[PDB]
Amino acid sequence: MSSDPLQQVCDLIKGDLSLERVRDIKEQLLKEKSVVEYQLNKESDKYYGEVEESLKLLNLSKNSVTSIKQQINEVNKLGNDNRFAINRYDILFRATKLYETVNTTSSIYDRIYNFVALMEHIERLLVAELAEDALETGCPHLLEIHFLLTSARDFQEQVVVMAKEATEDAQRTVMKLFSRLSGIISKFDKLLDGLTYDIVEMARAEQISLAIRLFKIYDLEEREDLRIEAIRNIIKKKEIEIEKSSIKKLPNSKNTARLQDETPKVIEYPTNKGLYQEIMSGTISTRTAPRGYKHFLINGINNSISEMFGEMREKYVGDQKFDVLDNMDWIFNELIIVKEHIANCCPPHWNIFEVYFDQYYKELHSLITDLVESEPETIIILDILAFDKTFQDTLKQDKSVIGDKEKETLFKDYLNLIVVKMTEWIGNLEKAEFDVFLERSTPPHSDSDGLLFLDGTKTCFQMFTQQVEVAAGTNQAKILVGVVERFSDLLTKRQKNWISKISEEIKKQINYNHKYDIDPESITPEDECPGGLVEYLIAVSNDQMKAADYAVAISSKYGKLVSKVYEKQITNHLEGTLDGFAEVAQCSSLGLITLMFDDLRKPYQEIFSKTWYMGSQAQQIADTLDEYLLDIKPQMNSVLFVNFIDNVIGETIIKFLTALSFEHSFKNKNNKFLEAMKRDFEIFYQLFVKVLDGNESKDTLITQNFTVMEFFMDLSCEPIDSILDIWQKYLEVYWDSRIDLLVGILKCRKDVSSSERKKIVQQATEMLHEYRRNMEADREPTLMRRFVLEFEKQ
Amino acid sequence: MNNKSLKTVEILKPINQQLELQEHLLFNNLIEEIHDIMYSKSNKTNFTR
């Protein structure tokens, strides 16, 4: 098969004739079919039982439900038994003679249409009672619901005026219509003056334990009675749409009609084809239809009386800047009290519990406009509406709260504010600091061993720590990252300015040392600047490490209530900066190494000439720079220090290998240069091992440079047949300084000639490049990185 | 049935199959022409008459 030949490959992953591994491979197939039949077993069982209940209930309802509608053949065909038999008496004279006077409702319509005129003219004040509450009307379950039933007796002139639509006469709704002017709208609007003044009376801060009880009881009685009443009229168009649109829209008319059907199919003709589905008989039977807006259409004015009192309590200024939700959420507390008080009053309607969430539309929509733009206090924009979001949540079910959706755009306003503010802050703090550091007689914040902290950087520390209190205070993935990481771009502008003006500190000590001991024909205006750059630039690296303290240590110290993704998005650009927290040391402290130097450039090129060969130039270099690392040594930050003295032994050996191209013929002749490589090697040893005390770097960060010491002793002292292996070994460590240095060494030498430079130094050039294909495919550029000295014609 | 077609083990079973079958026609006509009695015995040549 197309699987089996592939399965012949799967078992042909056992060999070709592999009967033991064919057996085991068959056991693997048995494991696969084993579990596939466990899950296919139980899954097939669940499907089978689903078919079992499926056909079991298709059975049970085919038979039993066929005997449920056929049990309606049993009991409903039993309904047809006593159709013209029952009630053992003159039922024919009960439904056609005693019920003939049921078609004789004349005098009740005259004294009740007339009494509906006069007494509801009286109930236009009595059942429309107000001024002020006295329990809301007084007693609007007596009063406003007396206007509801007086409007339900005038629902003969309001709802059964729509049932009596040309029943038998013309003045049943005309001469009684002036009896319905003071009859219907002096009872229905009396129940709506008592209903709008009931719910308005229920909008009156208590409101009350009997006022909202009676008033809301009328506004649930005539509210839900109105709901089933107009639901019985809409179910007279839906029971007529069920009934007359099963008659007119059978379809067997089949025109259908013009124009009392489609439209109004199906209503369809009042009294009684359009009425008796809401009228007699009809054990209701009007439908009621009181009161329409007791709270059937007037419960929206209660939750919109706390959501129009709430929305009215905004006072859109916001009366300090965001006090809209103060009085508005106060009306939300009155919405919870009026809500639960009214559900204690009225179960069916009249503000059961919707006043709370309607007032959450009042506080939500209210707080989403007081700080829509930056028109409120932009520093206090999201804290107010968010404080009412979570607090007005916690003041309720959490839920008459302030849903805002403008939190995050206002957090972009906090982005622009805190970022551009910290551009202003950071710029002033920088230029203040650097203009302090050019005053080189007093160091910053006191300690006598150069571990000084700073002042404006402390304002960055503590005061930017206070800038991110809204960041961590609201736990934003867009500010506590974004102000922090855009702030890290601001820190990149910082360390660029520490490179710039700390390089101007370097220039200041360069020409101040020109003023000190270096031939004073160099003097600049801003460089009147003696020794003392040590405490300044190390004070910088110290608050690089204290930017590690509050930036790194506060960073991972507080930010622990997101996942490590967003916490990590913070962590990408505050704590890799530890390398950055010596990267200024990549630019400051190398300047320190040259400013240990710049009082001493008179021996720095008189090396390789005859003065240093038997004199005290090595004394000045080694001992003076030794003391220069006998005062930076107490005064230096550690991460700056290891890299520092490392680059002191390195840079001081390349200032010990400065003058390899001055072409002074080497005094290995009478050993004057050679003692300058050997006896001065003792003097240039405690420049490595008295510079370094308190640690064991004395040769450890000097061994790599004893390579260029001893192999350079093999380069520049030794004769013809001992400069080959000089470039062998010196190639085996330092190919960064290339072969042509030896050419300069044979520029500084007569008694190893230029054809010897061809054989030794050019076959050794082939050693250099072919070993660079061989062994470098030695180590990095170093102190001897780009000191490939000039070569002649090989 | 399984053809199979090819190596792994079938084919390179079928060599010893078909040559084992001509080996059984070899031993078959050996015992057939043994006491055919084209060699005479009870057997080919173990004389019992």
mmCIF file of all heavy atoms in Angstrom, chain A residues 434-481, unseen atoms left out:
data_model
loop_
_atom_site.group_PDB
_atom_site.id
_atom_site.type_symbol
_atom_site.label_atom_id
_atom_site.label_comp_id
_atom_site.label_asym_id
_atom_site.label_seq_id
_atom_site.Cartn_x
_atom_site.Cartn_y
_atom_site.Cartn_z
ATOM 1 N N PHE A 434 29.275 68.922 34.930
ATOM 2 C CA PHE A 434 30.524 69.085 34.194
ATOM 3 C C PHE A 434 31.130 70.457 34.410
ATOM 4 O O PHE A 434 32.357 70.596 34.397
ATOM 5 C CB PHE A 434 30.306 68.870 32.704
ATOM 6 C CG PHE A 434 29.796 67.519 32.363
ATOM 7 C CD1 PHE A 434 28.573 67.372 31.736
ATOM 8 C CD2 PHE A 434 30.583 66.403 32.571
ATOM 9 C CE1 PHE A 434 28.102 66.135 31.394
ATOM 10 C CE2 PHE A 434 30.130 65.173 32.217
ATOM 11 C CZ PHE A 434 28.880 65.033 31.636
ATOM 12 N N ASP A 435 30.297 71.478 34.612
ATOM 13 C CA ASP A 435 30.872 72.764 34.971
ATOM 14 C C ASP A 435 31.328 72.815 36.427
ATOM 15 O O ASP A 435 32.091 73.719 36.784
ATOM 16 C CB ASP A 435 29.873 73.876 34.663
ATOM 17 C CG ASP A 435 29.641 74.040 33.166
ATOM 18 O OD1 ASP A 435 30.563 73.730 32.381
ATOM 19 O OD2 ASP A 435 28.533 74.464 32.774
ATOM 20 N N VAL A 436 30.900 71.869 37.271
ATOM 21 C CA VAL A 436 31.559 71.709 38.566
ATOM 22 C C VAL A 436 32.908 71.002 38.410
ATOM 23 O O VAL A 436 33.900 71.405 39.029
ATOM 24 C CB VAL A 436 30.625 70.990 39.564
ATOM 25 C CG1 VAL A 436 31.370 70.532 40.809
ATOM 26 C CG2 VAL A 436 29.512 71.922 39.993
ATOM 27 N N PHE A 437 32.987 69.976 37.544
ATOM 28 C CA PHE A 437 34.203 69.161 37.454
ATOM 29 C C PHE A 437 35.397 69.910 36.859
ATOM 30 O O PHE A 437 36.522 69.420 36.963
ATOM 31 C CB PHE A 437 33.988 67.886 36.622
ATOM 32 C CG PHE A 437 33.056 66.878 37.238
ATOM 33 C CD1 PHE A 437 31.904 66.493 36.569
ATOM 34 C CD2 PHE A 437 33.387 66.226 38.417
ATOM 35 C CE1 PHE A 437 31.049 65.550 37.107
ATOM 36 C CE2 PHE A 437 32.532 65.280 38.963
ATOM 37 C CZ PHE A 437 31.368 64.940 38.299
ATOM 38 N N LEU A 438 35.194 71.067 36.230
ATOM 39 C CA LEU A 438 36.306 71.855 35.707
ATOM 40 C C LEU A 438 36.892 72.827 36.733
ATOM 41 O O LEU A 438 37.525 73.816 36.343
ATOM 42 C CB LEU A 438 35.864 72.621 34.456
ATOM 43 C CG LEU A 438 35.580 71.797 33.199
ATOM 44 C CD1 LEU A 438 34.941 72.656 32.123
ATOM 45 C CD2 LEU A 438 36.860 71.173 32.676
ATOM 46 N N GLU A 439 36.707 72.562 38.024
ATOM 47 C CA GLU A 439 37.132 73.455 39.094
ATOM 48 C C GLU A 439 38.191 72.771 39.942
ATOM 49 O O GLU A 439 38.093 72.773 41.173
ATOM 50 C CB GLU A 439 35.945 73.859 39.969
ATOM 51 C CG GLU A 439 34.876 74.654 39.257
ATOM 52 C CD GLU A 439 33.699 74.960 40.159
ATOM 53 O OE1 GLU A 439 33.681 74.455 41.301
ATOM 54 O OE2 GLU A 439 32.793 75.701 39.728
ATOM 55 N N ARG A 440 39.198 72.179 39.297
ATOM 56 C CA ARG A 440 39.969 71.067 39.858
ATOM 57 C C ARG A 440 40.881 71.527 40.996
ATOM 58 O O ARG A 440 42.107 71.620 40.881
ATOM 59 C CB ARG A 440 40.732 70.381 38.734
ATOM 60 C CG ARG A 440 41.345 69.049 39.091
ATOM 61 C CD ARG A 440 41.609 68.328 37.807
ATOM 62 N NE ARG A 440 40.351 67.969 37.169
ATOM 63 C CZ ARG A 440 40.215 67.635 35.892
ATOM 64 N NH1 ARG A 440 41.271 67.644 35.094
ATOM 65 N NH2 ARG A 440 39.023 67.307 35.417
ATOM 66 N N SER A 441 40.238 71.842 42.121
ATOM 67 C CA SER A 441 40.870 71.967 43.430
ATOM 68 C C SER A 441 40.067 71.309 44.540
ATOM 69 O O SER A 441 40.634 71.030 45.601
ATOM 70 C CB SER A 441 41.091 73.439 43.789
ATOM 71 O OG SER A 441 39.855 74.098 44.000
ATOM 72 N N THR A 442 38.769 71.064 44.343
ATOM 73 C CA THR A 442 37.875 70.422 45.293
ATOM 74 C C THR A 442 37.120 69.288 44.613
ATOM 75 O O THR A 442 36.553 69.479 43.530
ATOM 76 C CB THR A 442 36.859 71.414 45.877
ATOM 77 O OG1 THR A 442 36.088 71.991 44.814
ATOM 78 C CG2 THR A 442 37.550 72.515 46.674
ATOM 79 N N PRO A 443 37.091 68.106 45.220
ATOM 80 C CA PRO A 443 36.333 66.987 44.650
ATOM 81 C C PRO A 443 34.881 67.017 45.103
ATOM 82 O O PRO A 443 34.525 67.784 46.011
ATOM 83 C CB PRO A 443 37.077 65.760 45.199
ATOM 84 C CG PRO A 443 37.634 66.216 46.483
ATOM 85 C CD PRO A 443 37.995 67.665 46.298
ATOM 86 N N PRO A 444 33.995 66.195 44.485
ATOM 87 C CA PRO A 444 32.607 66.085 44.964
ATOM 88 C C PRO A 444 32.458 65.338 46.283
ATOM 89 O O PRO A 444 33.438 65.157 47.014
ATOM 90 C CB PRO A 444 31.898 65.337 43.827
ATOM 91 C CG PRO A 444 32.695 65.642 42.638
ATOM 92 C CD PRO A 444 34.108 65.667 43.117
ATOM 93 N N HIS A 445 31.205 64.960 46.579
ATOM 94 C CA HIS A 445 30.666 64.476 47.855
ATOM 95 C C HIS A 445 31.589 63.539 48.624
ATOM 96 O O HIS A 445 31.951 62.466 48.140
ATOM 97 C CB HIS A 445 29.330 63.784 47.583
ATOM 98 N N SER A 446 31.881 63.930 49.865
ATOM 99 C CA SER A 446 33.158 63.669 50.519
ATOM 100 C C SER A 446 33.384 62.198 50.843
ATOM 101 O O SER A 446 32.572 61.572 51.534
ATOM 102 C CB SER A 446 33.251 64.495 51.800
ATOM 103 O OG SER A 446 33.248 65.882 51.515
ATOM 104 N N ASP A 447 34.483 61.653 50.319
ATOM 105 C CA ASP A 447 35.281 60.641 50.996
ATOM 106 C C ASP A 447 36.713 60.718 50.478
ATOM 107 O O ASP A 447 36.967 61.025 49.311
ATOM 108 C CB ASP A 447 34.694 59.214 50.878
ATOM 109 C CG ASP A 447 34.505 58.736 49.447
ATOM 110 O OD1 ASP A 447 34.750 59.472 48.479
ATOM 111 O OD2 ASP A 447 34.090 57.574 49.303
ATOM 112 N N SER A 448 37.658 60.465 51.384
ATOM 113 C CA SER A 448 39.071 60.709 51.114
ATOM 114 C C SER A 448 39.712 59.661 50.218
ATOM 115 O O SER A 448 40.903 59.783 49.916
ATOM 116 C CB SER A 448 39.854 60.784 52.428
ATOM 117 O OG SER A 448 41.246 60.938 52.188
ATOM 118 N N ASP A 449 38.975 58.641 49.797
ATOM 119 C CA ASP A 449 39.512 57.581 48.955
ATOM 120 C C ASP A 449 38.734 57.452 47.656
ATOM 121 O O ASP A 449 38.341 56.353 47.264
ATOM 122 C CG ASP A 449 40.565 56.231 50.792
ATOM 123 O OD1 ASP A 449 41.598 56.913 50.634
ATOM 124 O OD2 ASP A 449 40.346 55.543 51.810
ATOM 125 N N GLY A 450 38.475 58.592 47.008
ATOM 126 C CA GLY A 450 37.983 58.703 45.645
ATOM 127 C C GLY A 450 36.740 57.930 45.258
ATOM 128 O O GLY A 450 36.502 57.682 44.073
ATOM 129 N N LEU A 451 35.943 57.531 46.241
ATOM 130 C CA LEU A 451 34.680 56.860 45.962
ATOM 131 C C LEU A 451 33.514 57.818 46.164
ATOM 132 O O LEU A 451 32.489 57.489 46.766
ATOM 133 C CB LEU A 451 34.547 55.597 46.805
ATOM 134 C CG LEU A 451 35.673 54.586 46.542
ATOM 135 C CD1 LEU A 451 35.547 53.351 47.427
ATOM 136 C CD2 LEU A 451 35.775 54.204 45.073
ATOM 137 N N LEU A 452 33.705 59.037 45.663
ATOM 138 C CA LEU A 452 32.754 60.127 45.818
ATOM 139 C C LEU A 452 31.496 59.853 45.011
ATOM 140 O O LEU A 452 31.564 59.357 43.885
ATOM 141 C CB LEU A 452 33.387 61.403 45.291
ATOM 142 C CG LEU A 452 34.837 61.659 45.683
ATOM 143 C CD2 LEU A 452 35.004 62.325 47.022
ATOM 144 N N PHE A 453 30.345 60.211 45.559
ATOM 145 C CA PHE A 453 29.142 60.226 44.749
ATOM 146 C C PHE A 453 28.905 61.652 44.258
ATOM 147 O O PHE A 453 29.702 62.556 44.518
ATOM 148 C CB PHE A 453 27.949 59.644 45.511
ATOM 149 C CG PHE A 453 27.516 60.438 46.704
ATOM 150 C CD1 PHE A 453 26.454 61.320 46.608
ATOM 151 C CD2 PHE A 453 28.112 60.244 47.940
ATOM 152 C CE1 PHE A 453 26.024 62.036 47.706
ATOM 153 C CE2 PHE A 453 27.688 60.957 49.047
ATOM 154 C CZ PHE A 453 26.639 61.853 48.929
ATOM 155 N N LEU A 454 27.813 61.861 43.526
ATOM 156 C CA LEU A 454 27.578 63.149 42.873
ATOM 157 C C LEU A 454 26.251 63.746 43.329
ATOM 158 O O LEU A 454 25.530 63.175 44.151
ATOM 159 C CB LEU A 454 27.608 63.007 41.348
ATOM 160 C CG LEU A 454 28.910 62.441 40.781
ATOM 161 C CD1 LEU A 454 28.849 62.317 39.265
ATOM 162 N N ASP A 455 25.926 64.905 42.757
ATOM 163 C CA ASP A 455 24.862 65.767 43.256
ATOM 164 C C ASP A 455 23.667 65.846 42.319
ATOM 165 O O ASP A 455 22.534 65.577 42.734
ATOM 166 C CB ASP A 455 25.424 67.173 43.494
ATOM 167 C CG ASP A 455 26.550 67.183 44.506
ATOM 168 O OD1 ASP A 455 26.565 66.305 45.393
ATOM 169 O OD2 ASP A 455 27.429 68.064 44.410
ATOM 170 N N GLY A 456 23.888 66.213 41.058
ATOM 171 C CA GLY A 456 22.807 66.171 40.091
ATOM 172 C C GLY A 456 22.468 64.759 39.667
ATOM 173 O O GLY A 456 21.313 64.459 39.341
ATOM 174 N N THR A 457 23.459 63.870 39.690
ATOM 175 C CA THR A 457 23.187 62.462 39.447
ATOM 176 C C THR A 457 22.361 61.871 40.583
ATOM 177 O O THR A 457 21.575 60.951 40.355
ATOM 178 C CB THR A 457 24.506 61.712 39.259
ATOM 179 O OG1 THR A 457 25.343 62.464 38.374
ATOM 180 C CG2 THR A 457 24.268 60.387 38.589
ATOM 181 N N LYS A 458 22.492 62.418 41.797
ATOM 182 C CA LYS A 458 21.610 62.034 42.895
ATOM 183 C C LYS A 458 20.182 62.504 42.654
ATOM 184 O O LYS A 458 19.229 61.819 43.046
ATOM 185 C CB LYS A 458 22.144 62.590 44.217
ATOM 186 C CG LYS A 458 21.401 62.112 45.453
ATOM 187 C CD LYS A 458 21.524 60.614 45.578
ATOM 188 C CE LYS A 458 22.958 60.225 45.854
ATOM 189 N NZ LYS A 458 23.098 58.758 45.951
ATOM 190 N N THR A 459 20.016 63.663 42.007
ATOM 191 C CA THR A 459 18.688 64.120 41.604
ATOM 192 C C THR A 459 18.104 63.208 40.526
ATOM 193 O O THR A 459 16.888 62.976 40.483
ATOM 194 C CB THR A 459 18.779 65.573 41.127
ATOM 195 O OG1 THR A 459 19.341 66.379 42.170
ATOM 196 N N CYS A 460 18.966 62.639 39.678
ATOM 197 C CA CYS A 460 18.507 61.619 38.737
ATOM 198 C C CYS A 460 18.106 60.334 39.463
ATOM 199 O O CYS A 460 17.070 59.733 39.149
ATOM 200 C CB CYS A 460 19.592 61.341 37.694
ATOM 201 S SG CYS A 460 19.141 60.109 36.451
ATOM 202 N N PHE A 461 18.909 59.917 40.452
ATOM 203 C CA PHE A 461 18.703 58.715 41.259
ATOM 204 C C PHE A 461 17.373 58.749 41.983
ATOM 205 O O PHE A 461 16.417 58.046 41.631
ATOM 206 C CB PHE A 461 19.776 58.593 42.346
ATOM 207 C CG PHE A 461 21.138 58.307 41.854
ATOM 208 C CD1 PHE A 461 22.226 58.542 42.686
ATOM 209 C CD2 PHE A 461 21.357 57.824 40.586
ATOM 210 C CE1 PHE A 461 23.496 58.320 42.253
ATOM 211 C CE2 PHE A 461 22.632 57.603 40.153
ATOM 212 C CZ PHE A 461 23.693 57.834 40.978
ATOM 213 N N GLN A 462 17.317 59.628 42.976
ATOM 214 C CA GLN A 462 16.171 59.710 43.857
ATOM 215 C C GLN A 462 15.007 60.410 43.183
ATOM 216 O O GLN A 462 13.853 60.016 43.380
ATOM 217 C CB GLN A 462 16.562 60.457 45.130
ATOM 218 C CG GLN A 462 17.693 59.809 45.891
ATOM 219 C CD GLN A 462 18.100 60.549 47.134
ATOM 220 O OE1 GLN A 462 17.575 61.625 47.419
ATOM 221 N NE2 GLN A 462 19.036 59.982 47.889
ATOM 222 N N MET A 463 15.286 61.428 42.373
ATOM 223 C CA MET A 463 14.177 62.198 41.841
ATOM 224 C C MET A 463 13.598 61.546 40.595
ATOM 225 O O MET A 463 12.401 61.687 40.341
ATOM 226 C CB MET A 463 14.605 63.642 41.574
ATOM 227 S SD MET A 463 13.809 66.321 41.324
ATOM 228 C CE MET A 463 12.158 66.975 41.132
ATOM 229 N N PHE A 464 14.402 60.803 39.822
ATOM 230 C CA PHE A 464 13.781 60.009 38.768
ATOM 231 C C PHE A 464 13.138 58.745 39.330
ATOM 232 O O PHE A 464 12.153 58.247 38.758
ATOM 233 C CB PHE A 464 14.780 59.649 37.668
ATOM 234 C CG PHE A 464 14.142 58.954 36.507
ATOM 235 C CD1 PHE A 464 13.336 59.662 35.635
ATOM 236 C CD2 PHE A 464 14.307 57.595 36.309
ATOM 237 C CE1 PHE A 464 12.718 59.038 34.573
ATOM 238 C CE2 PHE A 464 13.693 56.962 35.240
ATOM 239 C CZ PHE A 464 12.896 57.686 34.376
ATOM 240 N N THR A 465 13.686 58.221 40.440
ATOM 241 C CA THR A 465 12.973 57.228 41.244
ATOM 242 C C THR A 465 11.594 57.743 41.655
ATOM 243 O O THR A 465 10.610 56.994 41.649
ATOM 244 C CB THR A 465 13.816 56.854 42.471
ATOM 245 O OG1 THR A 465 15.037 56.237 42.046
ATOM 246 N N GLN A 466 11.493 59.039 41.954
ATOM 247 C CA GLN A 466 10.185 59.636 42.183
ATOM 248 C C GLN A 466 9.440 59.970 40.892
ATOM 249 O O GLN A 466 8.218 60.156 40.935
ATOM 250 C CB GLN A 466 10.328 60.882 43.052
ATOM 251 C CG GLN A 466 10.735 60.554 44.472
ATOM 252 C CD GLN A 466 10.895 61.783 45.330
ATOM 253 O OE1 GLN A 466 10.783 62.909 44.849
ATOM 254 N NE2 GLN A 466 11.155 61.575 46.614
ATOM 255 N N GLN A 467 10.134 60.057 39.753
ATOM 256 C CA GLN A 467 9.432 60.243 38.486
ATOM 257 C C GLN A 467 8.699 58.982 38.063
ATOM 258 O O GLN A 467 7.650 59.065 37.415
ATOM 259 C CB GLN A 467 10.388 60.662 37.369
ATOM 260 C CG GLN A 467 10.950 62.062 37.472
ATOM 261 C CD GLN A 467 9.878 63.119 37.400
ATOM 262 O OE1 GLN A 467 9.591 63.790 38.387
ATOM 263 N NE2 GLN A 467 9.275 63.272 36.229
ATOM 264 N N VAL A 468 9.221 57.811 38.416
ATOM 265 C CA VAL A 468 8.611 56.556 38.001
ATOM 266 C C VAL A 468 7.633 56.027 39.052
ATOM 267 O O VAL A 468 7.276 54.850 39.023
ATOM 268 C CB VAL A 468 9.667 55.502 37.643
ATOM 269 C CG1 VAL A 468 10.446 55.947 36.431
ATOM 270 C CG2 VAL A 468 10.599 55.263 38.811
ATOM 271 N N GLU A 469 7.192 56.878 39.983
ATOM 272 C CA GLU A 469 6.176 56.452 40.939
ATOM 273 C C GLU A 469 4.804 56.339 40.289
ATOM 274 O O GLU A 469 3.939 55.614 40.794
ATOM 275 C CB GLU A 469 6.121 57.414 42.125
ATOM 276 C CG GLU A 469 7.373 57.411 42.980
ATOM 277 C CD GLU A 469 7.607 56.092 43.696
ATOM 278 O OE1 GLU A 469 6.618 55.429 44.072
ATOM 279 O OE2 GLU A 469 8.785 55.717 43.879
ATOM 280 N N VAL A 470 4.580 57.054 39.188
ATOM 281 C CA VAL A 470 3.362 56.866 38.408
ATOM 282 C C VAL A 470 3.522 55.667 37.479
ATOM 283 O O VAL A 470 2.559 54.934 37.216
ATOM 284 C CB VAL A 470 3.041 58.165 37.640
ATOM 285 C CG1 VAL A 470 1.762 58.037 36.817
ATOM 286 C CG2 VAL A 470 2.944 59.333 38.608
ATOM 287 N N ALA A 471 4.751 55.451 36.998
ATOM 288 C CA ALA A 471 5.082 54.298 36.163
ATOM 289 C C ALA A 471 4.827 52.987 36.894
ATOM 290 O O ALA A 471 3.977 52.185 36.488
ATOM 291 C CB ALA A 471 6.546 54.386 35.733
ATOM 292 N N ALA A 472 5.559 52.754 37.984
ATOM 293 C CA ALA A 472 5.314 51.571 38.798
ATOM 294 C C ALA A 472 4.011 51.689 39.577
ATOM 295 O O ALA A 472 3.420 50.669 39.947
ATOM 296 C CB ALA A 472 6.488 51.337 39.749
ATOM 297 N N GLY A 473 3.555 52.919 39.834
ATOM 298 C CA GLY A 473 2.324 53.112 40.579
ATOM 299 C C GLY A 473 1.088 52.672 39.823
ATOM 300 O O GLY A 473 0.096 52.263 40.434
ATOM 301 N N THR A 474 1.128 52.740 38.496
ATOM 302 C CA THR A 474 0.049 52.224 37.668
ATOM 303 C C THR A 474 0.432 50.950 36.927
ATOM 304 O O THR A 474 -0.445 50.335 36.306
ATOM 305 C CB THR A 474 -0.408 53.294 36.669
ATOM 306 O OG1 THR A 474 0.709 53.724 35.884
ATOM 307 C CG2 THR A 474 -0.990 54.490 37.401
ATOM 308 N N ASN A 475 1.702 50.541 37.013
ATOM 309 C CA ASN A 475 2.259 49.314 36.427
ATOM 310 C C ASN A 475 1.979 49.231 34.926
ATOM 311 O O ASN A 475 1.297 48.330 34.435
ATOM 312 C CB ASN A 475 1.742 48.067 37.152
ATOM 313 C CG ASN A 475 2.588 46.837 36.869
ATOM 314 O OD1 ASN A 475 3.592 46.910 36.162
ATOM 315 N ND2 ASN A 475 2.186 45.702 37.424
ATOM 316 N N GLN A 476 2.513 50.207 34.203
ATOM 317 C CA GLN A 476 2.307 50.289 32.768
ATOM 318 C C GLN A 476 3.349 49.473 32.021
ATOM 319 O O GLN A 476 4.541 49.523 32.334
ATOM 320 C CB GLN A 476 2.352 51.743 32.300
ATOM 321 C CG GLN A 476 1.235 52.559 32.879
ATOM 322 C CD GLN A 476 -0.113 52.055 32.431
ATOM 323 O OE1 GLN A 476 -0.325 51.782 31.251
ATOM 324 N NE2 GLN A 476 -1.020 51.875 33.381
ATOM 325 N N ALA A 477 2.889 48.723 31.022
ATOM 326 C CA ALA A 477 3.785 48.145 30.032
ATOM 327 C C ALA A 477 4.178 49.152 28.960
ATOM 328 O O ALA A 477 4.900 48.791 28.027
ATOM 329 C CB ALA A 477 3.142 46.915 29.387
ATOM 330 N N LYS A 478 3.724 50.401 29.083
ATOM 331 C CA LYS A 478 4.067 51.463 28.150
ATOM 332 C C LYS A 478 4.786 52.648 28.777
ATOM 333 O O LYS A 478 5.314 53.472 28.025
ATOM 334 C CB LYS A 478 2.809 51.984 27.439
ATOM 335 C CG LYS A 478 2.152 50.977 26.514
ATOM 336 C CD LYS A 478 1.060 51.630 25.689
ATOM 337 C CE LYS A 478 -0.162 51.935 26.528
ATOM 338 N NZ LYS A 478 -1.260 52.473 25.681
ATOM 339 N N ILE A 479 4.828 52.776 30.108
ATOM 340 C CA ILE A 479 5.562 53.841 30.784
ATOM 341 C C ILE A 479 6.709 53.286 31.614
ATOM 342 O O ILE A 479 7.858 53.718 31.475
ATOM 343 C CB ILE A 479 4.636 54.706 31.666
ATOM 344 C CG1 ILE A 479 3.668 55.517 30.826
ATOM 345 C CG2 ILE A 479 5.439 55.662 32.519
ATOM 346 C CD1 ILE A 479 2.760 56.336 31.679
ATOM 347 N N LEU A 480 6.418 52.300 32.471
ATOM 348 C CA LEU A 480 7.453 51.665 33.282
ATOM 349 C C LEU A 480 8.445 50.892 32.414
ATOM 350 O O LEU A 480 9.548 50.568 32.864
ATOM 351 C CB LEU A 480 6.797 50.763 34.334
ATOM 352 C CG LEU A 480 7.618 50.107 35.447
ATOM 353 C CD1 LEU A 480 8.261 51.142 36.363
ATOM 354 C CD2 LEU A 480 6.757 49.143 36.246
ATOM 355 N N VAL A 481 8.068 50.575 31.179
ATOM 356 C CA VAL A 481 9.055 50.331 30.134
ATOM 357 C C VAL A 481 9.405 51.620 29.394
ATOM 358 O O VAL A 481 10.578 51.971 29.278
ATOM 359 C CB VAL A 481 8.544 49.250 29.162
ATOM 360 C CG1 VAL A 481 9.579 48.983 28.075
#
